[PDB]
Ligand binder design. Structure first.
Ligand SMILES: *[C@H](C)[C@H]1/C(=C/c2[nH]c(/C=C3N=C(/C=C4\NC(=O)C(CC)=C4C)C(C)=C\3CCC(=O)O)c(CCC(=O)O)c2C)NC(=O)[C@@H]1C
Ligand SMILES: *[C@H](C)[C@H]1/C(=C/c2[nH]c(/C=C3N=C(/C=C4\NC(=O)C(CC)=C4C)C(C)=C\3CCC(=O)O)c(CCC(=O)O)c2C)NC(=O)[C@@H]1C
Ligand SMILES: *[C@H](C)[C@H]1/C(=C/c2[nH]c(/C=C3N=C(/C=C4\NC(=O)C(CC)=C4C)C(C)=C\3CCC(=O)O)c(CCC(=O)O)c2C)NC(=O)[C@@H]1C
Ligand SMILES: *[C@H](C)[C@H]1/C(=C/c2[nH]c(/C=C3N=C(/C=C4\NC(=O)C(CC)=C4C)C(C)=C\3CCC(=O)O)c(CCC(=O)O)c2C)NC(=O)[C@@H]1C
Ligand SMILES: *[C@H](C)[C@H]1/C(=C/c2[nH]c(/C=C3N=C(/C=C4\NC(=O)C(CC)=C4C)C(C)=C\3CCC(=O)O)c(CCC(=O)O)c2C)NC(=O)[C@@H]1C
Ligand SMILES: *[C@H](C)[C@H]1/C(=C/c2[nH]c(/C=C3N=C(/C=C4\NC(=O)C(CC)=C4C)C(C)=C\3CCC(=O)O)c(CCC(=O)O)c2C)NC(=O)[C@@H]1C
Ligand SMILES: CCC1=C(C)/C(=C/C2=NC(=C\c3[nH]c(/C=C4\NC(=O)C(C)=C4CC)c(C)c3CCC(=O)O)/C(CCC(=O)O)=C2C)NC1=O
Ligand SMILES: CCC1=C(C)/C(=C/C2=NC(=C\c3[nH]c(/C=C4\NC(=O)C(C)=C4CC)c(C)c3CCC(=O)O)/C(CCC(=O)O)=C2C)NC1=O
Lengths: 156, 67, 160, 167, 164, 158, 161, 161, 156, 156, 161
């Protein structure tokens, strides 16, 4: 989160929060209302976000384990899409991508290679979910969400 | 960041220390999490008996905030 | 870990989103953020002065300071005021974060063992911490002083 | 890199497969390998004698090195020079096993002249002693029964050629 | 051993053993019965080599702590030499010189200088044992075990092999 | 090769090539000619190995850039099959994977990630190449060659 | 570490005794198992990633240790477990090829239990998954070499209990 | 590293006075370009792997640089070229987000020509690859941000020149 | 500057700047006009700031080398004060104390201890200059300037 | 002490104390009687030394917290002066400033800044103690004690 | 580390006064034993290898702790024991010269027993070795200086017991 990172940056040179750190903290606390609005919107519409993203991702990339005829694989893909958008909600709530990084996007390649899932297919799907997140959000909301969606993109 | 409190004694089997190269082997040391795997492998490579590994900092099952 | 990070951890353990009670907790933190930032400015403004007054009001002119005592010698007085600055800065960090997890991760762990190993007297140390709580309560007021003194009592219990 | 890996790397860098010239050269090296291992064995059994006696012969022919002006006068420098002799003999034996001078290229000639100019070590007694080592290993190889002394000729000559100056 | 050195080198780079390492292992296992028979010849003939070498070395060098009147120093000399031939047989069975170095070359000179045995007399005694082992066993079986005798010999001729 | 690494091992723990290492390289020199003859057979069979392996690879993996309608991708893939066969013959000639490791295992994953070519698909193609090569070779020839195919596959099996 | 040859040499050398006939026949058994042990090590070296994939699929997936609150949740922990498995399989390959499990004792089981109890990593799920890995290598190597690597998988399972 | 504000302050500090009016005008220019600077850095951060892939595809693939004897042969060297392009792109993005090429001079350009001549790396083909990277980055952000970062790519080419 | 540390933090872990850091960059980029106004304010009334600060500094401490009757020492004290408020203006403009640190507080004590000048005397003069900047600036500008003033006070 | 530092220098390189170090030993041992005479001399007249040092220091630097009217502060300053001359006698006994450094000149500046007494005031007071020790001690004796006085000057 | 003078100063400093007459009398004792302590240090330094030779001869040789399976078996461990003995002698010399066993308590006895119990070094064997080394220093130094060095060798043994 932004607070923990600001403290550990103050901790590193063994000092108090500098003239910028308190300013970033005030920015975070005053944008908190907007962040809570984003989180509420995402938690409300995650179901249709996942459905529309899977629709666009299967219209775009169909050579996937997500649509290889096994319903367990498809249900797992939908659950993973919902989990990742929930992690993006955690990121916008925390003010930093560290809920996304420490849970979703650090061991991502080794894990999804171990699952034998093609990495670029997941990248395509995260791009689909990012586009639908634009489709439901306002301009600042969708910009702040697309931030962490492209974090997921970079991790793949 | 989450730390490991590690006590181990790593012996030397490939070199004779003359009088100054002798340092110590029984060390208790705070180890960062991101290096403890490599320190465990290194002191297993040199042939150390690891007698005590505990989590000095941080809790178990941390999904986030552990560093 | 901070208040937001603990909330995320709890809802990730339970696997769901942040419910309305956790959203109330988060709105509490987010509306306390401005006054916590003002108190952080104030503690960063006069940290050395706070340490000066607390060593004067709690640690000086007892035989702990003179010969055979633990703050005798220049280096041990420097180490003691260094530890006092440590406690002040880390209580400030915990006030900014809204949780005492930073004190439980960096301050309180190992500290009782090290203080008992060096012969540092824990009782006068906890007295110095609560005298710091009193001085910050005096120079910031009731509310922000209450918020930071809660984490000072957390440090006081961790030494205890 | 031995002869095998050097030749393979060359053909890799030009993209060709193995032609019959390479197969003939590889088979030639594999046939000479028995003699190469025999010389490595005799070297590992008589290395201290060979290196030290070459140092002694060099100090007899070049007298100044043990004289006070020379850079092998004291026993500290004398032991350093004999350790250098052991270095040359060991890496020349490595090259004898490999059949290639890559080991010498990366581990003997990688700055030897710079070190010997920094410390004032004379280059030409060093290569003279290298040649005494080569003649010594040649003669006890001939006594051992190895008719082909061509293999053992090459690493010492390579070290001498890369180390020596241009007259 | 060969497998020991390969496992150590493979775990250093955190990688599985390559096909050439496994070819090395299979070739050593193919020669394993032969090397076991080499060790068998060494086991059968070791005390004769020790007794003839100790007699020859005492004749060539009387100023020797074993050749001093004490029986325990004598028994210790035979014990040390038989132990060295034991490590040579271990080197035959392992496939490399690990059980000579690790179990008695590494820290050997300083061991004996702490004991008080002169190491040049040790060198001469080992030269004698090498001679009677060359003359005792066979021709082909000498080529396998006498190089390890040379390996233990080569560690102590090095204050400087003497010339004019 | 075993001889380079045994030289490096003697160099690290400073000493000469001891007698066991000398017997190891003696067995290497004795096994040389067989490696040479099987390298000659691989050089004779390399083209047909590529053809049959590509046919079996497309049978076992039709959704690939090589099997697309673009023939540049197919030509690059067939060139890759020939290159890996040449490197495998290099590894067979050396007796270890040092040409293979030096040229086509170290960094091959990073390249094919930078080319977006699926490394599982390359691993499957090398599996089919292994099957074609083992079919085209005798039982002991298969015993020599198949490990180098295995090590090429495992270098991208991730 | 110790391999089969080194444990035989060590057992004889800690007695001031040449290797005897029981030791020479045990070393003979090692020498005659060497070819299939090398072939099994090469097969595992080829198929390690597939082994770990199938192992985690059949023992550790679609259970609550994977979902939220599970120990294999939060992808870096899944990757940590997969790294643990690659190390388990490579060290089992080392133990099976060397003939002795001492490499396991001095590079896995020393420290592994206390690290897992320090981190809250469940040892029972680790052991069940490791024996599932053993079953996988049994499935696609054969009965003989599969059991030979399964002995050292049993040692990893026992040393964690 | 001196960014635009830092080098501006350095000029005025060497002159000893405050930042003069024209210096404040340039700082205003930087302060109103910073939003598109952040957005351009955001898109480069997202699509860095794609940018390097298409750049190598348009300037370094299907030439004799990738054939045998070319410098991009022997897969590790292809990966080295990929990681050098990644260094070029990320450090040019740093320079664009900073508003001055000091990070390119200090972290990249100060001895890269010596290193590339020492290794035999093609300087001219790296310059062509960097210009192709400038074209690729130009293509998916648009003219303004594209030239704003292509200035730093051209600076990389000039420092390799 | 703050953006220099943003780029250096993206560096040394070999990563691109996170959109959280990009957000810090956006916020600094919109506070730039206020910071330029504050720096113009300091460059405007620096003369009276040094005059009044020296006045109150000699009022609270007459036992300084600056008022020992040697007017060259008073000139050097005036010039040190002016240089430091110039550095604080640089810090405001850069959004971080690192210009101020790397020009006037890294080797601060070695320089002033070589100059045979008491450290706490410079600190108390800095407190006087801080109070003057408090007196002449608006409240947010006063906080921003007095924070870097306090940074110098900590450096002494 | 000198003995300790001889031992530490023979340590950290794993050697025996060299013949020259043992010459130092056997000579510092022959230096012992004059050192006891100095310690007894400094202990015997310490009260008058601190009185006359306070006299001259209050004459020369009157802007001190010692003469602010609080006799508690005055008595504490006299206690500090007596403690420091005790440490200097200790350093004569040990043969080096190791007791002096370890007890009184390691955290000297940080402590007296926590106590808010100006550092140069302590320096002037110790200079007064230095010149009274010149007054009360013979020339060689004045040298051996003024050495550690100059050490106290360096720390302040 | 602390010497006899340093401890006298330290107790007097913790009490708050100059050295009283008893502390100065202990100083007299130390300063008048300094000559013999220096001579004993010269003798121990000159004959260190011989002392370790006779010490290992009279306590450690000819018993099964040097036999197969023993601790001083496998020559590198015997040389490790030689190094430990020489280290103990040199640190006993440091302790004897300083007049204090504080250096031993800081650098020798701090964690040595736990270390040896972790390596499997027989603690009783090295304690008997230190008492034998005490006897050797007694024989070749005299009764007085031998007893003095024997005090710090006793401190080594007590910290090892
Ligand atoms: C002062 C209020 C009391 C006091 C203090 C005192 N402390 C030490 C020594 C140490 N203090 C610590 C503590 C910390 N180190 C850290 O990094 C943290 C930050 C989270 C803490 C809290 C430690 C570890 C030491 C030992 C190492 C060091 O020197 O820092 C001393 C010195 C003791 C000695 O003999 O060296 C003293 C005097 N003493 C009192 O009497 C007060 C009640
Ligand atoms: C075929 C088995 C798979 C496949 C292949 C494919 N490869 C490319 C392009 C290249 N492949 C290489 C290969 C190598 N470089 C080396 O140094 C070595 C080792 C010695 C090898 C094998 C290179 C250099 C290229 C770049 C092109 C060139 O030759 O300059 C492509 C084309 C990708 C593109 O976008 O052009 C393809 C398709 N395709 C499959 O379906 C198989 C899995
Ligand atoms: C969907 C976008 C893509 C896809 C999905 C897919 N995933 C799996 C299996 C798993 N996915 C996960 C995921 C996570 N665990 C975590 O801790 C995190 C962060 C919160 C994530 C995202 C896991 C653990 C599994 C394993 C199964 C399980 O949950 O127990 C599958 C099944 C693969 C199979 O064959 O079993 C699938 C299909 N597939 C696609 O094609 C999309 C690109
Ligand atoms: C996988 C089968 C199970 C599992 C794994 C898991 N492990 C960790 C963390 C660590 N595991 C180790 C491992 C080892 N130490 C050694 O010496 C050896 C070599 C043989 C091994 C395998 C280490 C060192 C760590 C800590 C350091 C690091 O993680 O790099 C975790 C993460 C725990 C956490 O809190 O993050 C996990 C998840 N978890 C399961 O549920 C499986 C049953
Ligand atoms: C006198 C030369 C100067 C001066 C002194 C002054 N000191 C105090 C208070 C204290 N002084 C000390 C000092 C030490 N304790 C140690 O262990 C060491 C090492 C030997 C030192 C130097 C301490 C600890 C105190 C605190 C209380 C006490 O008496 O122990 C004061 C009073 C501070 C106040 O106002 O509360 C004063 C005035 N003042 C001068 O003007 C001189 C330059
Ligand atoms: C000899 C008298 C006895 C003996 C010795 C023995 N020691 C070791 C190994 C080590 N000894 C040390 C000792 C020290 N290190 C220090 O820093 C200091 C001061 C605290 C000491 C005294 C260490 C650290 C080691 C291990 C590494 C090293 O050897 O340098 C061994 C080897 C044991 C093993 O290999 O496991 C032995 C044999 N053994 C006896 O039986 C004698 C009575
Ligand atoms: C301390 C000064 C010093 C000395 C004395 C020293 C010794 C030394 N003498 C040496 C050699 C000899 N000393 C001697 C002779 C003696 N050396 C003596 O002191 C005595 C009394 C004898 C026995 C008679 C012999 C015969 C050699 C043979 C040299 C050879 O092997 O060719 C050498 C070798 C180099 C050379 O030949 O010059 C060295 C390094 N090196 C040094 O640094
Ligand atoms: C296997 C590694 C090893 C070796 C070689 C070893 C050496 C050893 N031999 C020892 C001793 C001797 N070696 C010898 C040997 C020789 N006497 C000689 O003059 C020659 C040429 C030799 C060849 C080694 C003698 C006479 C002794 C008497 C013991 C003494 O003088 O102290 C001992 C004494 C303890 C004991 O026997 O139990 C030791 C520790 N012990 C080991 O651990």
């Amino acid at each position: 989160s932004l607070v923990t990172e600001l403290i550990l940056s103050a901790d590193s040179e063994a000092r108090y929060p500098a003239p910028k750190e308190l300013r970033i903290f005030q920015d975070f606390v005053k944008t908190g209302e907007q962040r809570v609005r984003i989180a509420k919107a995402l938690a409300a519409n995650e179901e249709r976000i996942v459905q529309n993203g899977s629709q666009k991702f299967w219209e775009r990339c169909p050579n996937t384990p997500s649509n290889s005829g096994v319903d367990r694989k498809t249900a797992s893909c939908q659950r993973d899409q919902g989990w990742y958008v929930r992690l993006i909600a955690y990121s916008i709530l925390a003010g930093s991508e560290r809920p996304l990084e420490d849970i979703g996007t650090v061991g991502i390649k080794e894990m999804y290679n171990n699952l034998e899932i093609p990495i670029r297919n997941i990248a395509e799907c995260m791009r689909c979910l990012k586009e639908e997140a634009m489709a439901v959000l306002s301009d600042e909301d969708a910009q702040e969400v697309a931030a962490y969606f492209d974090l997921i993109i970079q991790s793949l | 960041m989450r730390m490991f409190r590690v006590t181990a004694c790593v012996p030397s089997q490939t070199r004779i220390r003359t009088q100054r190269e002798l340092q110590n082997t029984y060390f208790t040391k705070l180890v960062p999490y991101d290096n403890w795997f490599k320190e465990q492998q290194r002191i297993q490579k040199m042939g150390g008996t690891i007698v005590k590994v505990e989590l000095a900092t941080g809790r178990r099952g941390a999904n986030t905030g552990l560093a | 870990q901070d208040a937001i990070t603990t909330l995320i951890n709890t809802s990730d353990a339970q696997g769901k989103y942040l419910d309305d009670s956790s959203l109330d907790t988060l709105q509490e933190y987010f509306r306390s953020g401005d006054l916590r930032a003002k108190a952080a400015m104030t503690i960063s403004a006069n940290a050395s002065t706070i340490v000066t007054k607390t060593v004067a009001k709690s640690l000086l002119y007892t035989d702990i300071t003179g010969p055979g005592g633990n703050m005798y010698t220049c280096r041990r007085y420097a180490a003691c005021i260094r530890d006092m600055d440590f406690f002040l800065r880390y209580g400030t960090y915990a006030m900014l974060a809204g949780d005492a997890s930073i004190l439980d991760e960096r301050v309180l762990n190992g500290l009782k063992e090290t203080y008992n190993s060096l012969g540092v007297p824990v009782g006068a140390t906890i007295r110095a911490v609560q005298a710091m709580k009193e001085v910050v309560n005096d120079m910031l007021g009731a509310e922000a002083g209450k918020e930071v003194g809660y984490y000072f009592d957390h440090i006081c219990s961790g030494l205890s | 890199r031995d002869t095998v890996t050097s030749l393979i790397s060359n053909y890799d860098t030009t993209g060709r497969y193995l032609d019959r010239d390479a197969i003939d050269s590889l088979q030639s090296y594999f046939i000479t390998g028995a003699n190469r291992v025999k010389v490595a064995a005799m070297i590992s059994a008589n290395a201290a004698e060979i290196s030290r006696e070459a140092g002694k012969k060099l100090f007899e022919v070049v007298p100044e090195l043990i004289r006070p002006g020379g850079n092998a006068y004291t026993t500290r420098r004398y032991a350093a020079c004999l350790r250098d002799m052991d270095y040359y003999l060991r890496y020349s034996s490595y090259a004898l096993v490999a059949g290639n001078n890559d080991v010498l290229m990366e581990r003997v000639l990688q700055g030897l002249r710079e070190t010997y100019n920094s410390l004032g070590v004379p280059i030409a007694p060093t290569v003279q002693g290298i040649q005494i080592m080569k003649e010594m290993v040649k003669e006890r190889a001939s006594d051992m029964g190895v008719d082909d002394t061509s293999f053992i000729d090459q690493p010492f000559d390579f070290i001498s050629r890369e180390v020596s100056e241009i007259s | 051993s060969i497998v020991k050195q390969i496992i150590s080198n493979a775990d250093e780079e955190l990688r599985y053993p390559t096909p050439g390492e496994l070819e090395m292992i299979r070739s050593f296992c193919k020669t394993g019965a032969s090397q076991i028979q080499l060790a068998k010849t060494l086991e059968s003939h070791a005390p004769t080599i020790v007794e003839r070498g100790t007699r020859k070395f005492w004749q060539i060098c009387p100023r020797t702590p074993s050749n001093s009147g004490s029986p325990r120093k004598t028994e210790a000399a035979q014990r040390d030499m038989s132990w060295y031939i034991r490590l040579i047989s271990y080197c035959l069975l392992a496939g490399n010189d690990q059980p000579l170095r690790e179990i008695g070359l590494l820290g050997m000179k300083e061991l004996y200088t702490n004991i008080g045995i002169p190491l040049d007399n040790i060198l001469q005694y080992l030269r004698c044992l090498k001679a009677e082992a060359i003359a005792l066993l066979s021709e082909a079986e000498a080529e396998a075990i006498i190089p390890y005798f040379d390996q233990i010999i080569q560690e102590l001729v090095r204050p400087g092999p003497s010339y004019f | 090769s075993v001889i380079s690494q045994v030289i490096a091992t003697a160099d690290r723990e400073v000493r000469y090539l001891s007698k066991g290492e000398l017997d190891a390289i003696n067995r290497f020199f004795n096994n040389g000619p067989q490696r040479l003859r099987i390298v000659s057979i691989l050089n004779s069979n390399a083209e047909e190995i590529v053809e049959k392996g590509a046919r079996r690879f497309w049978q076992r993996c039709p959704i690939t850039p090589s099997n697309s309608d673009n023939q540049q991708f197919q030509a690059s893939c067939l060139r890759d099959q020939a290159w890996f066969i040449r490197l495998i013959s290099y590894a067979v000639a050396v007796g270890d994977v040092d040409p293979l490791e030096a040229s086509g295992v170290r960094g091959v994953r990073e390249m094919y990630l930078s080319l977006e070519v699926p490394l599982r698909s390359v691993a499957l193609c090398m599996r089919s190449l292994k099957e074609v090569t083992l079919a085209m070779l005798s039982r002991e020839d298969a015993a020599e060659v198949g490990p180098y195919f295995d090590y090429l596959i495992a270098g991208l099996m991730p």
